[PDB]
Enzyme design. Sequence first.
Site, PDB file in Angstrom:
ATOM      1  N   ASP A   1       0.813  -1.217   0.000  1.00  0.00           N
ATOM      2  CA  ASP A   1       0.000   0.000   0.000  1.00  0.00           C
ATOM      3  C   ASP A   1       0.841   1.258   0.000  1.00  0.00           C
ATOM      4  O   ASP A   1       1.294   1.733   1.053  1.00  0.00           O
ATOM      5  CB  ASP A   1      -0.916  -0.069   1.229  1.00  0.00           C
ATOM      6  CG  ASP A   1      -1.977   1.015   1.251  1.00  0.00           C
ATOM      7  OD1 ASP A   1      -1.850   1.999   0.497  1.00  0.00           O
ATOM      8  OD2 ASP A   1      -2.943   0.874   2.026  1.00  0.00           O
ATOM      9  N   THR A   2       1.097   1.813  -1.184  1.00  0.00           N
ATOM     10  CA  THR A   2       1.906   3.014  -1.286  1.00  0.00           C
ATOM     11  C   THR A   2       1.224   4.209  -0.608  1.00  0.00           C
ATOM     12  O   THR A   2       1.886   5.242  -0.417  1.00  0.00           O
ATOM     13  CB  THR A   2       2.267   3.406  -2.739  1.00  0.00           C
ATOM     14  OG1 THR A   2       1.069   3.671  -3.481  1.00  0.00           O
ATOM     15  CG2 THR A   2       3.030   2.287  -3.424  1.00  0.00           C
ATOM     16  N   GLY A   3      -0.047   4.076  -0.260  1.00  0.00           N
ATOM     17  CA  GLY A   3      -0.796   5.163   0.356  1.00  0.00           C
ATOM     18  C   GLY A   3      -0.642   5.101   1.865  1.00  0.00           C
ATOM     19  O   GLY A   3      -1.124   5.956   2.608  1.00  0.00           O
TER      20      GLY A   3
HETATM   21  N1  LIG Z   1      -4.196   3.366   1.151  1.00  0.00           N
HETATM   22  C1  LIG Z   1      -3.919   4.069   2.407  1.00  0.00           C
HETATM   23  C2  LIG Z   1      -5.198   3.860   3.214  1.00  0.00           C
HETATM   24  O1  LIG Z   1      -5.072   2.517   3.696  1.00  0.00           O
HETATM   25  C3  LIG Z   1      -5.040   2.280   5.020  1.00  0.00           C
HETATM   26  O2  LIG Z   1      -5.160   3.224   5.779  1.00  0.00           O
HETATM   27  C4  LIG Z   1      -4.864   0.886   5.610  1.00  0.00           C
HETATM   28  C5  LIG Z   1      -5.298   0.829   7.091  1.00  0.00           C
HETATM   29  C6  LIG Z   1      -4.356   0.738   8.129  1.00  0.00           C
HETATM   30  C7  LIG Z   1      -4.784   0.788   9.543  1.00  0.00           C
HETATM   31  C8  LIG Z   1      -6.133   0.932   9.853  1.00  0.00           C
HETATM   32  C9  LIG Z   1      -7.123   1.109   8.772  1.00  0.00           C
HETATM   33  C10 LIG Z   1      -8.553   1.319   9.119  1.00  0.00           C
HETATM   34  C11 LIG Z   1      -9.501   1.467   8.103  1.00  0.00           C
HETATM   35  C12 LIG Z   1      -9.104   1.428   6.678  1.00  0.00           C
HETATM   36  C13 LIG Z   1      -7.750   1.239   6.352  1.00  0.00           C
HETATM   37  C14 LIG Z   1      -6.721   1.148   7.418  1.00  0.00           C
HETATM   38  N1  LIG Z   2      -4.196   3.366   1.151  1.00  0.00           N
HETATM   39  C1  LIG Z   2      -5.604   2.986   1.006  1.00  0.00           C
HETATM   40  C2  LIG Z   2      -6.292   3.756   2.131  1.00  0.00           C
HETATM   41  O1  LIG Z   2      -6.383   5.090   1.613  1.00  0.00           O
HETATM   42  C3  LIG Z   2      -7.588   5.661   1.442  1.00  0.00           C
HETATM   43  O2  LIG Z   2      -8.578   5.034   1.772  1.00  0.00           O
HETATM   44  C4  LIG Z   2      -7.769   7.057   0.857  1.00  0.00           C
HETATM   45  C5  LIG Z   2      -9.165   7.637   1.173  1.00  0.00           C
HETATM   46  C6  LIG Z   2     -10.158   7.742   0.184  1.00  0.00           C
HETATM   47  C7  LIG Z   2     -11.519   8.203   0.528  1.00  0.00           C
HETATM   48  C8  LIG Z   2     -11.827   8.532   1.844  1.00  0.00           C
HETATM   49  C9  LIG Z   2     -10.816   8.349   2.906  1.00  0.00           C
HETATM   50  C10 LIG Z   2     -11.177   8.650   4.316  1.00  0.00           C
HETATM   51  C11 LIG Z   2     -10.221   8.500   5.325  1.00  0.00           C
HETATM   52  C12 LIG Z   2      -8.851   8.034   5.015  1.00  0.00           C
HETATM   53  C13 LIG Z   2      -8.515   7.741   3.682  1.00  0.00           C
HETATM   54  C14 LIG Z   2      -9.536   7.830   2.608  1.00  0.00           C
END
Ligand SMILES: NCCOC(=O)Cc1cccc2ccccc12
Ligand SMILES: NCCOC(=O)Cc1cccc2ccccc12
Lengths: 99, 99
Positions: free
Chosen positions: B25-27
Amino acid sequence: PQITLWQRPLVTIKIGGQLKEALLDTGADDTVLEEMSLPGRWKPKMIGGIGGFIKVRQYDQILIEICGHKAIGTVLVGPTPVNVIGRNLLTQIGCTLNF
Amino acid sequence: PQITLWQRPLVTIKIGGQLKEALLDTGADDTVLEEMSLPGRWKPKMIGGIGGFIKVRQYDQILIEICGHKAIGTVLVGPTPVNVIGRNLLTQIGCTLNF
Ligand SMILES: NCCOC(=O)Cc1cccc2ccccc12
Ligand SMILES: NCCOC(=O)Cc1cccc2ccccc12
Ligand SMILES: NCCOC(=O)Cc1cccc2ccccc12
Ligand SMILES: NCCOC(=O)Cc1cccc2ccccc12
């Protein structure tokens, strides 16, 4: 380009006659951007799921340009707290993960 | 390897003498995994921020193996709903975004 990941992979994107900044997010299935006007017939879409959902407008066959690479695909538009380029458009520009 | 993004980039990881599945997950800035036992002195860490936080245990200098590439870095352990390999460990294995 080849983009390393020491820092967040933020890029400038060309879309809807405007410039925005967005994160290249392989963890995102879809592309979600802040409010803007785009052409076409849109329909509402509920996104997320983990803890709840937000409603966005789904616009299909939208043209985008990332780092000078053009692509066409679906852009979700609405109150996202984070602008992300997801896998749907990453595939279009031929972006891969390499090691 | 070269990994395309038509589908979620799930990989099997070797860590703590066990096999888990995690998303590249690069994000994600950090690496967060489901409950497991790891060596070392840990300290609590609050992660997220957008809508709230969850508490995880931060373990540093942990060895991981991804697709047969080994790396050492920080692994956050706790109730994550999603196992992700974040940029901290992606950099370690020399993973880049390419188009
Ligand atoms: N793509 C960056 C967003 O991806 C994440 O943030 C993974 C993640 C890591 C820890 C807790 C979470 C809780 C809900 C949803 C994704 C979560
Ligand atoms: N790395 C996958 C998780 O990254 C995301 O999910 C981006 C994103 C897209 C839409 C709404 C969001 C709300 C909170 C936090 C990240 C969100
Ligand atoms: N307490 C409400 C916080 O719950 C959410 O924020 C759910 C949510 C809705 C839309 C997009 C998301 C993206 C990543 C993680 C959670 C998301
Ligand atoms: N209504 C509570 C939902 O709020 C959250 O879920 C916040 C949260 C906490 C930890 C990790 C995250 C990762 C992505 C998106 C939101 C996250």
